[PDB]
Design a protein around this nucleic acid. Structure first.
Ligand code: A1D6G
Ligand code: MG
Lengths: 112, 120, 43, 48
RNA sequence: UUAAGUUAUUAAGGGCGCACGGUGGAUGCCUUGGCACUAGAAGCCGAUGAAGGACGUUACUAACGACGAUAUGCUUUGGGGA
RNA sequence: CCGAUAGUGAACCAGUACCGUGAGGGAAAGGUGAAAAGCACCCCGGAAGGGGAGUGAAAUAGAACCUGAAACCGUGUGCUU
RNA sequence: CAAUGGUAGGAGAGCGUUCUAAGGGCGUUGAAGCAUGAUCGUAAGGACAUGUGGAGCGCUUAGAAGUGAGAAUGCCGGUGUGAGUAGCGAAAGACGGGUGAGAAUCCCGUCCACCGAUUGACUAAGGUUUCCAGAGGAAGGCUCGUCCGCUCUGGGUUAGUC
RNA sequence: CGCGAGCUGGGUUCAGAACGUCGUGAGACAGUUCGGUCCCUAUCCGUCGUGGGCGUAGGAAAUUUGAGAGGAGCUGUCCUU
RNA sequence: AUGAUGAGGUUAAUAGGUUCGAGGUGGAAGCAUGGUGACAUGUGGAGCUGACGAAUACUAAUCGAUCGAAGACUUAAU
């Protein structure tokens, strides 16, 4: 029915990963893969791999064959942020938040 | 024409170097803008080669870099000689073209549309 | 610009350093406080 | 030259309504059936 | 059909409710460690080299204890018990 | 009397990170489970991760590990514009 | 039958939090916390049910207090907004081949360019292992990274005359 | 005494110095004189341009009237009569 | 600025190249003659010529994909 695949503490700020996931929401598996592999953004390779894992999970665990799969829902939410600093002018230091992302994708057969 | 995000001396140099390298390899990979701008330079050099008179040889020597190609059987000859002995004959009957361009997908480090400019 | 602390091992160990603090009673004091405090670098 | 007040969540989400990435210009490749970008060479096959 | 009049639909996005996630480390429970005392010891250590250190020491090896070239310990007298 | 923003500055290799030329100043940081039983194998991936299977009473107890609030960030939508 | 706006302020009655004494109770057949709900009292507030939770905690009377926070440009810790904005720290790169999961960014080659009283060679002060050869890619490199002054392993400094 | 998050900074109003005057003195004078650091990446309203969505009871391509709105709006000399 | 606007996508002159020309510059190269040399003369208004005008599919706009109507009531005339 539903296959799950998650990538955690990915090193991409969640605002940036969500821009690519706003395309594969609700599309077919083949079309979704073609989008990711052709969208020229940074997060795209890391998501094409979370999708891949879900689909493999589906086949190997549920016999859910990949020709009928649709990204039921796919989202991304914040992760354990890493705090750093940049030496700025006049002795002052400003902060730099290197963020992360918890990418989730679930693909469904639409059935029960 | 285009400026390629670069000065005049650095562009003159880049265009002629890219034209030479194309002549060496007969197909190269680069970004669209520079392919679109080397197209004319390489096409004009081949024209200087379709005549072969000493004037055109001397005049095409301005652009090409001085490079040496090792052909099969350890035979050696320079870019001018290639242009005027192996490429003039190939396009003696064609009245234009001389080059094609095949767009490719964006590269990784940038969003630059890489292309392959090849001698047709 | 020439900033402060142009390092120099000899002067560092001359103006400071164990034997210099052991040369004056007040020098003997700072070692006393630093041991009471349990410091690891005494001079 | 400093924000006189906060930009509420409403205003924030409102401004970024038009801030989105477009689906790629992809078409199916005639030799292999895999998707490719239009006017580019298929990277899976290598055709036209 | 034509005139006049009236009224949906829309949601790029937003709001409000609700559901489910994340982030974060409040709260509750907990104690290794502290705080204030009481009663009794004890209230001098050094040229016999002190107090405090530095280097070392293990089968292998950095740190912490312990130890000192007899070094991750030796002897002896007693206690004990795999 | 205090229960981890408290109680020592220090429950944890703390007068230590660290800062200062130096006197000196001076932190932050406890909690898996009863038992480590600390996840044999398989699947995607270069790996990090994950998803099954298994351990366990429990694995949204999987080592950043008890409970897990709010700010904040998302994904759906019933009613609205 | 009369009275009941109220600030500085006076008076009175109370609700709550921790602990203690005693009495009486509840608890893996699920305590405290946490979340939700359309419940009760005049208020401070009190219950009940359902979920998570995996061991303590209520009630009556009375005692004691580190007892109630929304403001102190308060302290500590988290997370916002500005915003996918400013910035990416003086400069010339191009292309072929190779390596890899991945390459404008790593290795080799050709061409081109910059310095050249120096961006070259030595040697002091200072720093101490940054030195060398393999290997790795979390983190650090203002991007990427197969690379490195980064990480792991093993090595490397030889004087009668300096 | 419009306008410095649009500009200058000559005057004036910091610290230096000097002359005249006052004060025993330190110093003083709206008395002169030479010199003297002008920071800010625009959130909102406002304004100048430029897109997308939706509505105009079907979906469209072109030509349009004009409810309104804005811009202009100055004037000399010579000759003739 | 970007997006818009406009000219075009093979049943094609939209851009590049090729050919011819306008305009600009001013006598290319190699020869032969003359000079000891520095140079000069003829070839030959030659040679070169970014955006400007025209012709030509030689090269690239090849393949394909997405969005987009079926027309409400009420009343009056018809
Ligand atoms: C570079 C960035 C920094 O900006 C600045 O320096 C700017 C330039 C400065 O502009 C001005 O000078 N006025 C505009 C120029 C006015 O000319 C008239 C002739 C005069 C004079 C005068 C009089 C007395 C004294 C004095 O007595 C004395 C001493 O030593 O005692 C020292 N001198 C120099 C005096 C000189 C800011 C903006 C200044 O504010 C302004 O001052 C005034 C008090 C009031 C102004 N308003 C309220 C009317 C105000 O707007 C401050 C004070 O700066 C010194 C800003 C404060 C906040 C700072 O400290 C920041 C952090 C700066 N510090 C720094 O590093 O970044 C800065 C931003
Ligand atoms: Mg500095």
């Amino acid at each position: 029915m539903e296959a799950k695949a998650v990538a955690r503490t990915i090193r991409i700020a969640p605002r940036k990963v969500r821009l690519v996931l706003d395309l594969i929401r609700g599309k077919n598996a083949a079309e979704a893969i073609a989008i990711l592999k052709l969208t020229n953004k940074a997060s795209s390779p890391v998501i094409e791999k979370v999708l891949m894992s879900a689909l493999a999970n589906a086949e190997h665990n549920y016999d859910m064959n990949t020709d009928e799969l649709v990204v039921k829902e796919a989202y991304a939410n914040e992760g354990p942020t890493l705090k750093r600093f940049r030496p700025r002018a006049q002795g002052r230091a400003s902060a730099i938040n290197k963020r992360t992302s918890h990418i989730t994708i679930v693909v469904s057969d639409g059935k029960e | 024409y285009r400026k390629l995000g670069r000065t005049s001396d650095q562009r003159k140099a880049m265009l002629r170097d890219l034209a030479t390298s194309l002549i060496i390899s007969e197909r190269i990979e680069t970004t669209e803008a520079r392919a679109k701008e080397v197209r004319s330079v390489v096409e004009k050099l081949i024209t200087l080669g379709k005549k072969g008179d000493l004037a055109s040889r001397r005049n095409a020597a301005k652009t090409l870099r001085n490079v040496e190609i090792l052909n099969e059987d350890e035979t050696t000859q320079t870019a001018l000689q290639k242009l005027f002995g192996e490429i003039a004959e190939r396009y003696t009957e064609r009245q234009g073209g001389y080059t094609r361009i095949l767009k490719q997908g964006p590269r990784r480090g940038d969003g630059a549309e890489s292309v392959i400019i090849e001698l047709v | 610009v020439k900033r402060t602390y142009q390092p120099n091992k000899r002067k560092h160990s001359k103006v400071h350093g164990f034997r210099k603090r052991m040369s004056t009673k007040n020098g003997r004091k700072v070692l006393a406080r630093r041991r009471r405090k349990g410091r690891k670098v005494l001079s | 030259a400093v924000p006189k007040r906060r930009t509420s969540k409403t205003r924030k989400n409102k401004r970024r309504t038009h801030f989105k990435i477009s689906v790629p210009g992809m078409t199916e490749c005639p030799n292999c059936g895999e998707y490719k970008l239009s006017h580019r060479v298929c990277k899976n096959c290598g055709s036209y």
